[PDB]
DNA sequence: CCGACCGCGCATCAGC
DNA sequence: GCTGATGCGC
DNA sequence: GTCGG
């Protein structure tokens, strides 16, 4: 909002690396100076001010002085005056291809989703996908969607066995007004660290949804992680929804609480929990919560049974998810 | 100055 | 056919 | 590209 012409142009930039120079770590570098200059309350006014944030070096400060005198950068005009790059940037937009696939089909003069849909000899299964369901997969989800959704697949989950414990997280979690994909949380008494004695469990959860035409496509699927498509059911008078994106773990019952726990967030949530995990002697990962010994050994991973416990383990105010922002 | 920069499940490829 | 590396999205 | 050891 308040800066939006600097973090626009610090996100093309960070989509360059990563699509073009395949510099994961320039992308992630422009990324992390994008989110800090977004939660700036002022209106920046020079690069030196912006160089005083965490993650805003030498380079984006004078790239910001550049943007201020003139409104746009040279560096970024080349770039989108440059049909390769652009095409190679703009082909990463279907899911499934990425800096390097987009380089080889720009490469061999497959440029657009016409092009890709001439050469759909030439995609995998997940690219397909991707290009089948292109505008949808870049639309958001409206909360009021994704709370049906949940009801679905919270229901669905429900008749295959009653034991299951299935968790949407996320933003949704937090209260999002819109998400970008459906995350779930799954977990059963049957699986766990120490043994599976269920061969299936996953299977069965992902074949209901099936069968009920809730879920649509497969992007891929193994034992413990499903990556798919759904789409809510049309009410015979109205438009259709569009597809979504939904992912489905299935976590180990002893782990499932520290994987709610992670996979809520929001990541500076998380970044600021686990320093203060670490101050009280505990470090905490995706999967465990583990003491700290004299010399900072981790030790055994400690009971969890609800997200709290591990709240009450580092002597914090429970937390509800609502209010895990910062 | 110099290496770290999330780590991992799955699909597919590369090399045998 | 096998095992390990790579691409990919998260 | 930025940071911190
Ligand atoms: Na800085
Ligand atoms: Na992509």
């Not at 299964?125 to 049906?148: C, T």
């Not at 809730?214 to 438009?239: A, H, Y």
């Not at 004299?294 to 400690?302: F, I, N, Q, S």
């Amino acid at each position: 909002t308040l800066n939006g012409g600097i973090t626009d142009m610090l996100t093309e930039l960070a989509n360059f690396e990563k699509n073009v120079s395949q510099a994961i770590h320039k992308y992630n570098a422009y990324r992390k100076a994008a989110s800090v200059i977004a939660k700036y309350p002022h209106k920046i006014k020079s690069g030196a001010e912006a160089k005083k944030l965490p993650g805003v070096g030498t380079k984006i400060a004078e790239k910001i002085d550049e943007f201020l005198a003139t409104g746009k950068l040279r560096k970024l005009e080349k770039i989108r005056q440059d049909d390769t790059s652009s095409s190679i940037n703009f082909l990463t937009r279907v899911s499934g291809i990425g800096p390097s696939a987009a380089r080889k089909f720009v490469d061999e003069g497959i440029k657009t989703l016409e092009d890709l849909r001439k050469n759909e000899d030439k995609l995998n299964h997940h690219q397909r996908i991707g290009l089948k369901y292109f505008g949808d997969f870049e639309k958001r989800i409206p909360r009021e969607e994704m709370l049906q959704m949940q009801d679905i697949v919270l229901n669905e989950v429900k008749k295959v066995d009653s034991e299951y414990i299935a968790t949407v997280c996320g933003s949704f979690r937090r209260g999002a007004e819109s998400s970008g994909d459906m995350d779930v949380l799954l977990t059963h008494p049957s699986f766990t660290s120490e043994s599976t004695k269920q061969p299936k469990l996953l299977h069965q959860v992902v074949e209901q949804l099936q069968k009920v035409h809730f879920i649509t496509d497969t992007l891929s699927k193994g034992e413990t992680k499903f990556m798919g498509v759904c789409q809510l059911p049309s009410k015979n008078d109205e438009k259709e929804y569009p597809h979504r994106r939904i992912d489905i773990r299935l976590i180990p019952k002893d782990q499932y609480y520290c994987g709610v726990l992670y996979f809520t967030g929001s990541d500076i949530f998380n970044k600021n929990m686990r320093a203060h995990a670490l101050e009280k002697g505990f470090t905490i990962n995706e999967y465990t919560i583990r003491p700290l010994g004299v010399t900072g050994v981790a030790g055994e991973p400690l009971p969890v049974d609800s997200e709290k416990d591990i709240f009450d383990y580092i002597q914090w105010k429970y937390r509800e998810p609502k209010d895990r922002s910062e």
